[PDB]
Design an enzyme around this catalytic site. Structure first.
Site, PDB file in Angstrom:
ATOM      1  N   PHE B 142       0.858  -1.172   0.000  1.00 14.61           N
ATOM      2  CA  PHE B 142       0.000   0.000   0.000  1.00 14.61           C
ATOM      3  C   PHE B 142       0.894   1.220   0.000  1.00 14.61           C
ATOM      4  CE2 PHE B 142      -3.886   2.344   0.629  1.00 14.61           C
ATOM      5  CZ  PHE B 142      -3.435   3.517   1.188  1.00 14.61           C
ATOM      6  N   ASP B 228      10.085   1.859   0.733  1.00 16.35           N
ATOM      7  CA  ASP B 228       9.040   2.744   1.227  1.00 16.35           C
ATOM      8  C   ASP B 228       9.047   2.655   2.746  1.00 16.35           C
ATOM      9  OD1 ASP B 228       6.783   4.102   2.032  1.00 16.35           O
ATOM     10  OD2 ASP B 228       5.438   3.091   0.620  1.00 16.35           O
ATOM     11  N   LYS B 257       4.879  10.646   6.740  1.00 17.57           N
ATOM     12  CA  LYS B 257       3.899  10.516   7.799  1.00 17.57           C
ATOM     13  C   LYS B 257       4.482  11.089   9.091  1.00 17.57           C
ATOM     14  CE  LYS B 257       0.792   6.637   6.518  1.00 17.57           C
ATOM     15  NZ  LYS B 257       0.873   7.027   5.118  1.00 17.57           N
TER      16      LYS B 257
HETATM   17  C1  LIG Z   1       0.194   6.089   4.226  1.00 17.17           C
HETATM   18  N1  LIG Z   1      -0.573   5.114   4.974  1.00 17.17           N
HETATM   19  C2  LIG Z   1      -1.994   4.910   4.741  1.00 17.17           C
HETATM   20  C3  LIG Z   1      -2.972   6.038   4.645  1.00 17.17           C
HETATM   21  C4  LIG Z   1      -4.049   5.833   5.702  1.00 17.17           C
HETATM   22  C5  LIG Z   1      -5.523   6.168   5.470  1.00 17.17           C
HETATM   23  O1  LIG Z   1      -5.914   7.339   5.276  1.00 17.17           O
HETATM   24  O2  LIG Z   1      -6.372   5.241   5.491  1.00 17.17           O
HETATM   25  C6  LIG Z   1      -3.782   4.459   6.376  1.00 17.17           C
HETATM   26  C7  LIG Z   1      -2.648   3.810   5.537  1.00 17.17           C
HETATM   27  F1  LIG Z   1      -1.866   2.846   6.102  1.00 17.17           F
HETATM   28  C8  LIG Z   1       1.274   5.423   3.367  1.00 17.17           C
HETATM   29  C9  LIG Z   1       1.538   5.900   2.087  1.00 17.17           C
HETATM   30  C10 LIG Z   1       0.757   7.056   1.461  1.00 17.17           C
HETATM   31  O3  LIG Z   1       0.972   8.235   2.178  1.00 17.17           O
HETATM   32  P1  LIG Z   1      -0.200   9.384   2.081  1.00 17.17           P
HETATM   33  O4  LIG Z   1      -0.467   9.677   0.622  1.00 17.17           O
HETATM   34  O5  LIG Z   1      -1.456   8.862   2.738  1.00 17.17           O
HETATM   35  O6  LIG Z   1       0.287  10.624   2.788  1.00 17.17           O
HETATM   36  C11 LIG Z   1       2.538   5.287   1.355  1.00 17.17           C
HETATM   37  N2  LIG Z   1       3.231   4.274   1.835  1.00 17.17           N
HETATM   38  C12 LIG Z   1       3.008   3.811   3.049  1.00 17.17           C
HETATM   39  C13 LIG Z   1       3.839   2.639   3.573  1.00 17.17           C
HETATM   40  C14 LIG Z   1       2.031   4.364   3.861  1.00 17.17           C
HETATM   41  O7  LIG Z   1       1.814   3.847   5.144  1.00 17.17           O
END
Ligand SMILES: *[C@H](NC1=C[C@@H](C(=O)O)C[C@@H]1F)c1c(COP(=O)(O)O)cnc(C)c1O
Ligand SMILES: *[C@H](NC1=C[C@@H](C(=O)O)C[C@@H]1F)c1c(COP(=O)(O)O)cnc(C)c1O
Lengths: 404, 404
Positions: B142, B228, B257
């Site tokens: 993800f 990542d 994050k």
């Molecule tokens: C961000 N992690 C995810 C977004 C969350 C949600 O809103 O449901 C829960 C989930 F685990 C993420 C990303 C993407 O970053 P953003 O675009 O959301 O800022 C990319 N890689 C990883 C590993 C994660 O955790």
């Protein structure tokens, strides 16, 4: 001693990616229409961070919104609720007269969200077979730098070398209703995405009636009209939305960039239920999307736009600005265009001379602007500018152009 | 009177998109490890906004960084320079020992940036013919919700109904070195992107030696290793990067994050010159990427991680947390896994019983967590938790599990 301008440039060159070539100026403070570099020099901001600071740099109401909310809560993730989001959602949906908003962070994220909505609506409502849905874009479009966004671009600098491209994105000329009518004969088209004025392309203003025609053709052929107002919205052109100039209601409206006054990355996707609810729980989101801090900042930025009548100021002062710009000689400035306070001039680019050298000299004379193609210079000061401030900046522009 | 929890839920239901089904709790303040809802009830945060608040909610040093910078300047756009960006860039590149950083806002934007770097490097350095470059991903990955990010997903809820997909993305099993070795026989592969522990998939920890093997295979076949670490980085697993557990240096490192402590959307792409400089000026960017406010906040968040030794705390307290969790009976909790303070338990999901009901009862007992699949419950409190606080929360977890 603290770093000079040249130290700042050199340090970024060594430790940062080279994806930009900025105008050599190292800014430190911004307040309202003004920016100060590390040497203390003062400038008019005539870029407004591509309209992200319509409210001027560090507007005290939005600054106070930020400060009050950060002492408190900034991020729960949408795995839980916070208070602020629902308040902001009611506010913005009633302000723009759509059922619902989907909150995101950056403009390109709102664009991606729109594309996903259009496809999901195409399959679940229009009945397109998976996965044959198409989205149509206008040549010259700019909506971000993701793989999908550069897949719809006609600018080689955006897409060249960036791997195979997203299928299902078709391109037609901008400001061309016959070409749109031709594209929409394909029932597999789900949407047409378009900027009411193309910003990055050089403030390309379509002909009167274009937006009305787009709406009519989209309605006629059961196609979603997506209006990207991330740069043209929120008073910049003299209305809440540039589409308001033709009393046109798009199916999806994208907002960004001034949605926060430059204090936080906040973007929004607005549309009615029969489109929005095609996306079910768990099927789309973002970590920072809809966080309480950005929501407070966005409520404040929208309130600043409304209470200070910045759309009317943009209208009148843009009339003044274009009228004055047209007095520059035809031998040097071949075109003046724009709406409200989103404007541009076109340079008779020699090789003795070009838009970059003009912007360098403008910086030398206390005004900051940047070219968008090499003969195009954008003029877009914060909407808080007053007429005397605007006339002094126009004086700077005259002094600079007639310096050559 | 101010809105109750139920008012908050109902208002979001009416005016907001339905892309989430959150745990019914309406939070208002966060400080350190704690969150308070609108009724005044107090909870341990055992989600940490998916590790965005590793430093705990509203860490005063990062709050003060935000407040000091917003009184000043927040956004010039990268059409000009600001001071803060170069300072932050030097800081983070020296901290992680890479030549350069490319700043973006959200995690998915860092992922997209990585994909663009890998393709551009594949064509300009590896010599792949345009546009035949491939990127390999691990099933369960993800990395966001753009069209490109869901194109690499194996989760139907992420991609189903979302139009035709990005070509050139191949998927292999996670934790599978033979499958990677098989995929990398294609010289048109430019990169392999992988999470050192898969977060959204349910805290899936690969076998010891997996990361070492990935590095060896990528080096052997001239393929870029993209790690990542947006969720696993910045002390969450007990090290600066989860890859540090095997002393592995990826070619590209993604951070997000906690890069801001939850105060601002800040993301980073780290790599050396021979990769980073494949992207030339004008060929990639973002409006809010690298803005001064986020840069101040990020410097402060990284400093908090370093000065408070939060990686060591994460290591020791995660040992304690997993040891205690394993004492719950096998009849109800079939698995306990994680590293540092990124952990999860697996529920013997009946239909008398499931992970959602468990999280509801945990909320009832003062601890907030959310399931990620229906038998998987994540436990990930802020890294500022102390041992006695952790043991009280463990008491809450025991009380809740043995309530059934
Ligand atoms: C961000 N992690 C995810 C977004 C969350 C949600 O809103 O449901 C829960 C989930 F685990 C993420 C990303 C993407 O970053 P953003 O675009 O959301 O800022 C990319 N890689 C990883 C590993 C994660 O955790
Ligand atoms: C944002 N506008 C663009 C980004 C800028 C840059 O960094 O060079 C200049 C340019 F005009 C934009 C977007 C994308 O929003 P973000 O992802 O950058 O937040 C989408 N649509 C439009 C119309 C605009 O202007």
């Amino acid at each position: 001693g603290p770093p000079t301008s040249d130290d700042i440039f050199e340090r970024e060159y060594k430790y940062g990616a080279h994806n930009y070539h900025p105008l050599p100026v190292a800014l430190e403070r911004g307040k309202g229409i003004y920016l100060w570099d590390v040497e203390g020099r003062k400038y008019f901001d005539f870029l407004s961070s591509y309209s992200a600071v319509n409210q001027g740099h560090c507007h005290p109401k939005i600054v106070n919104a930020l400060k009050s909310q950060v002492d408190k809560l900034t991020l729960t993730s949408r795995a839980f609720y916070n208070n602020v989001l629902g308040e902001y959602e009611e506010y913005i949906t009633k302000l723009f007269n759509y059922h619902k908003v989907l909150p995101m962070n950056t403009g390109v994220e709102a664009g991606e969200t729109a594309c996903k909505l259009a496809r999901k609506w195409g399959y679940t409502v229009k009945g397109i077979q998976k996965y044959k849905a198409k989205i149509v874009f206008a040549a010259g479009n700019f909506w971000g730098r993701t793989l999908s966004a550069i897949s719809s671009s006609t600018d080689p600098t955006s897409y060249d070398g960036f791997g195979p491209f997203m299928p299902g994105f078709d391109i037609i000329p901008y400001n061309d209703l016959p070409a749109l009518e031709r594209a929409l004969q394909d029932p597999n088209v789900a949407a047409f995405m378009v900027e009411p004025i193309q910003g990055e392309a050089g403030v390309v203003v379509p002909d009167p009636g274009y937006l009305m025609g787009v709406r009519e053709l989209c309605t006629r052929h059961q196609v979603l009209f997506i209006a990207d107002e991330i740069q043209t919205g929120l008073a910049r052109t003299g209305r809440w939305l540039a589409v308001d100039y033709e009393n046109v209601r798009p199916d999806i409206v994208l907002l960004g960039k001034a949605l926060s006054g430059g204090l936080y990355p906040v973007s929004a996707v607005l549309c009615d239920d029969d489109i929005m609810l095609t996306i079910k729980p768990g099927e789309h989101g973002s970590t920072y999307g809809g966080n309480p801090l950005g929501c407070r900042v966005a409520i404040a930025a929208l309130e600043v736009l409304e209470e200070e009548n910045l759309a009317e100021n943009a209208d009148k002062l843009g009339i003044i600005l274009r009228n004055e710009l047209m007095k520059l000689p035809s031998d040097v400035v071949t075109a003046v265009r724009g709406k409200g306070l989103l404007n541009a001039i076109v340079i008779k680019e020699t090789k003795d001379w070009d838009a970059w050298k003009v912007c360098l000299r403008l910086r030398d004379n206390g005004l900051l602007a940047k070219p968008t193609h090499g003969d195009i210079i954008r003029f877009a000061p914060p909407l808080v500018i007053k007429e005397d401030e605007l006339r002094e900046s126009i004086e700077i522009i005259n002094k600079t152009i007639l310096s050559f």
